[PDB]
Amino acid sequence: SKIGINGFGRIGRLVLRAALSCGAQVVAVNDPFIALEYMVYMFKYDSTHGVFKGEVKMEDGALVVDGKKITVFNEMKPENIPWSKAGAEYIVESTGVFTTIEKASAHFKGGAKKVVISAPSADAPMFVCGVNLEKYSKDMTVVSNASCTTNCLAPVAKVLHENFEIVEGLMTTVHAVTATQKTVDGPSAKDWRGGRGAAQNIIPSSTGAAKAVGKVIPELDGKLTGMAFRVPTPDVSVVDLTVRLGKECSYDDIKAAMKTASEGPLQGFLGYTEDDVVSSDFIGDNRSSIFDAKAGIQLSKTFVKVVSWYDNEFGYSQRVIDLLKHMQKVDSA
Amino acid sequence: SKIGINGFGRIGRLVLRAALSCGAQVVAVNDPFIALEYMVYMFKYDSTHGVFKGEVKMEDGALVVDGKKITVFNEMKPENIPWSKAGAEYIVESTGVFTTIEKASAHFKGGAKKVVISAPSADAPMFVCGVNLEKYSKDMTVVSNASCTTNCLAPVAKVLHENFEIVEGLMTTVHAVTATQKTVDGPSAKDWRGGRGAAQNIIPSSTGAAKAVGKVIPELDGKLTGMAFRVPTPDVSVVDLTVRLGKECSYDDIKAAMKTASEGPLQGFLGYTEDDVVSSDFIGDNRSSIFDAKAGIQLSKTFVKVVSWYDNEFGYSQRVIDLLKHMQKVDSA
Numbered sequence: 001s002k003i004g005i006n007g008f009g010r011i012g013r014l015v016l017r018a019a020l021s022c023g024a025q026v027v028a029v030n031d032p033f034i035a036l037e038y039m040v041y042m043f044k045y046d047s048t049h050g051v052f053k054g055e056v057k058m059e060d061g062a063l064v065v066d067g068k069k070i071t072v073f074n075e076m077k078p079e080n081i082p083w084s085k086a087g088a089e090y091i092v093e094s095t096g097v098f099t100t101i102e103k104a105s106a107h108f109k110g111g112a113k114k115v116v117i118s119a120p121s122a123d124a125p126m127f128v129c130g131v132n133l134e135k136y137s138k139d140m141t142v143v144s145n146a147s148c149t150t151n152c153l154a155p156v157a158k159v160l161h162e163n164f165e166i167v168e169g170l171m172t173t174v175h176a177v178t179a180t181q182k183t184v185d186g187p188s189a190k191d192w193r194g195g196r197g198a199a200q201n202i203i204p205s206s207t208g209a210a211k212a213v214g215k216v217i218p219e220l221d222g223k224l225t226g227m228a229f230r231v232p233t234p235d236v237s238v239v240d241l242t243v244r245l246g247k248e249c250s251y252d253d254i255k256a257a258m259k260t261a262s263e264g265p266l267q268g269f270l271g272y273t274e275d276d277v278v279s280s281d282f283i284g285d286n287r288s289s290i291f292d293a294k295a296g297i298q299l300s301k302t303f304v305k306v307v308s309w310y311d312n313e314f315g316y317s318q319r320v321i322d323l324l325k326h327m328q329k330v331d332s333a
Numbered sequence: 334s335k336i337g338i339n340g341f342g343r344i345g346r347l348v349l350r351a352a353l354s355c356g357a358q359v360v361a362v363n364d365p366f367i368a369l370e371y372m373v374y375m376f377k378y379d380s381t382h383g384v385f386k387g388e389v390k391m392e393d394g395a396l397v398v399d400g401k402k403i404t405v406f407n408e409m410k411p412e413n414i415p416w417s418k419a420g421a422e423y424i425v426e427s428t429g430v431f432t433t434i435e436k437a438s439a440h441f442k443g444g445a446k447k448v449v450i451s452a453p454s455a456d457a458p459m460f461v462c463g464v465n466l467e468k469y470s471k472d473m474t475v476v477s478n479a480s481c482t483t484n485c486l487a488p489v490a491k492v493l494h495e496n497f498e499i500v501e502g503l504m505t506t507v508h509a510v511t512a513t514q515k516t517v518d519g520p521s522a523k524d525w526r527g528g529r530g531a532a533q534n535i536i537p538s539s540t541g542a543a544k545a546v547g548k549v550i551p552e553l554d555g556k557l558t559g560m561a562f563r564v565p566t567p568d569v570s571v572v573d574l575t576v577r578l579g580k581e582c583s584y585d586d587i588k589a590a591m592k593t594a595s596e597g598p599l600q601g602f603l604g605y606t607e608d609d610v611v612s613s614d615f616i617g618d619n620r621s622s623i624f625d626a627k628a629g630i631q632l633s634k635t636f637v638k639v640v641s642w643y644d645n646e647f648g649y650s651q652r653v654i655d656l657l658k659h660m661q662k663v664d665s666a
């Protein structure tokens with residue numbers, strides 16, 4: 001394609017990494033609070049996933065990724081930052097704060113052209129590879145890729161709602177740690193989630209599963225809402241989902257619905273292991289939304305329980321890249 | 334006496350809790366980030382060491398810590414922040430930045446007088462219990478309380494030296510705790526110490542061991558040096574040591590010298606016990622530096638290896654307080 005990145009730190013690494021092996025092309029990297037030498041060791045060496053490969057070294061004004069000429073920009077606040085340099089018309093922002101068109105688009109001034117991001121957003125285009133279909137078209141400057149939780153779910157709905165329709169359902173996600181969770185105990189910050197923890201506590205926490213879903217698959221777009229529980233589980237996570245249903249259920253029926261369908265188009269999204277209680281392995285299995293039958297599956301007529309999953313950290317990597325290609329083609333096509 | 338604190342965070346809780354039960358009088362803590370309501374829940378709230386009795390509450394812009402009317406100060410930078418104002422005559426300091434007369438006296442600025450600090454202090458009076466003896470006189474306005482490690486350590490010498498003089502001492506800490514260590518993997522900041530962990534991956538690193546020890550009896554100063562190992566362990570900690578000396582030995586012999594002497598002057602510092610290898614229990618055992626014969630022991634005549642215990646969180650506290658009383662009385666005199 002041809003792109004650059006906000007935040008060498010988690011999501012990025014792969015974006016860069018996946019874009020390289022996974023998808024493709026060339027670029028540049030934007031990270032004040034991480035320097036040249038670092039980019040190398042850092043991106044190369046990561047606790048969750050293992051190590052890199054290739055060569056993680058800097059030569060000429062920059063870092064050499066499988067020699068695919070790459071660079072680092074220090075800058076705080078995109079504007080400040082070039083981006084013009086290299087010509088990375090398609091940009092991926094991990095970030096945190098940076099949510100919404102302004103700052104996103106702002107990016108443009110410094111350079112940019114198209115912007116697609118890691119994280120939900122109230123104002124601005126919202127997306128994911130699952131149901132995205134026709135949604136995104138040239139009209140577009142910027143778009144977003146559903147949260148770790150969100151992207152995973154959108155898929156689940158499809159076969160359940162479309163095939164089973166769906167009325168009234170709620171949820172929880174037992175999760176693997178994000179940047180935000182701290183060691184020992186102490187302060188915290190916004191929306192709180194009491195930042196008292198790490199190794200000691202199973203921590204209650206919330207989310208925008210509804211909104212995201214709805215917009216990803218409106219119809220739904222209200223018939224859902226959610227919350228969550230964080231554990232020391234560093235990398236990787238699973239979700240529990242609840243629903244009531246019009247067409248009558250058979251646990252045999254459901255997991256199958258997904259399976260057959262699963263086979264289908266969806267691919268980078270789906271899964272279905274009858275296999276057997278896999279904890280949280282995945283973690284670089286190489287799967288998008290990926291679910292299973294049995295697990296803690298349970299059944300009755302109009303009411304049922306289902307559970308799918310995540311391998312967030314990474315998994316998100318592949319559908320941003322997934323989109324970047326869709327995006328790429330779409331726009332310039 | 335009369336005190337105030339730099340940053341409601343770890344040490345402080347106790348700093349205060351203790352000073353409250355253990356020592357006394359009262360205070361007002363300093364912190365732009367940590368707020369009013371916040372404080373009470375926070376302090377009162379620690380899975381690690383526990384939950385507080387009495388009651389932690391916010392009134393007329395003050396915290397009611399076991400009644401004893403209390404103040405909270407919102408300033409970034411001491412100088413900036415009042416002191417005297419609230420009647421805070423002695424001031425302990427909970428940070429690394431602030432270490433040294435520069436910022437130190439600063440507190441004086443706002444309105445202090447006596448300063449006492451969590452952590453070593455190359456520039457300025459430095460100290461520990463055992464050796465702290467006469468050392469501390471009105472002469473000084475500010476003194477530094479050694480690191481978690483160091484205080485636990487200084488104990489070693491005392492016995493090793495007087496017991497065997499000693500011409501060669503070295504060491505290793507099985508450590509845990511401290512924020513910097515970030516979840517998963519990323520930046521970290523100055524000095525390296527790789528904040529590349531938590532649960533997965535242990536982290537090499539060095540600090541306050543040999544070097545400092547000296548001031549608490551330089552005699553030894555030189556015949557020593559140190560480095561440390563950190564486990565995902567939240568709180569508690571163990572030190573290992575090695576030395577060669579003037580002899581007359583047996584692991585039995587040694588523990589005995591320390592035991593007897595242990596009882597002796599030192600008491601609230603030292604120990605012995607036994608209990609095979611006990612464990613990292615001592616998480617609020619209720620003692621300073623505490624060691625054990627058995628735990629682990631190795632022997633070769635003019636050379637042996639030993640181990641000790643320092644519950645950093647809870648431990649250092651008693652000792653700083655321990656000093657707050659000494660200091661106090663010391664100067665007023």
Ligand SMILES: NC(=O)c1ccc[n+]([C@@H]2O[C@H](COP(=O)([O-])OP(=O)(O)OC[C@H]3O[C@@H](n4cnc5c(N)ncnc54)[C@H](O)[C@@H]3O)[C@@H](O)[C@H]2O)c1
Pocket residue numbers: 006007008009010011012030031032033034075076077094095096118119147148177178179312313314316519520
């Ligand atoms: N962490 C996950 O597992 C995960 C999963 C899915 C989505 N996300 C999304 O990723 C984003 C952050 O997650 P991450 O762990 O991959 O990020 P990260 O915190 O590891 O990235 C932040 C780092 O990027 C660099 N950076 C670039 N621009 C910066 C700026 N303006 N200010 C400060 N630092 C800047 C700095 O090195 C900074 O420390 C969030 O939007 C989050 O919702 C994260």
Ligand SMILES: NC(=O)c1ccc[n+]([C@@H]2O[C@H](COP(=O)([O-])OP(=O)(O)OC[C@H]3O[C@@H](n4cnc5c(N)ncnc54)[C@H](O)[C@@H]3O)[C@@H](O)[C@H]2O)c1
Pocket residue numbers: 187339340341342343344363364366367410427428429430451452453479480481482510511512645646649
């Ligand atoms: N952690 C230990 O086990 C241990 C043991 C002995 C000594 N110490 C000493 O404690 C200090 C840090 O360790 P800790 O975890 O016990 O402390 P903490 O990090 O975890 O305490 C820091 C607190 O100060 C606040 N703060 C932030 N910026 C500040 C500023 N500019 N001025 C004042 N307060 C500010 C923070 O918000 C937080 O509440 C170091 O000086 C260290 O040498 C720690």
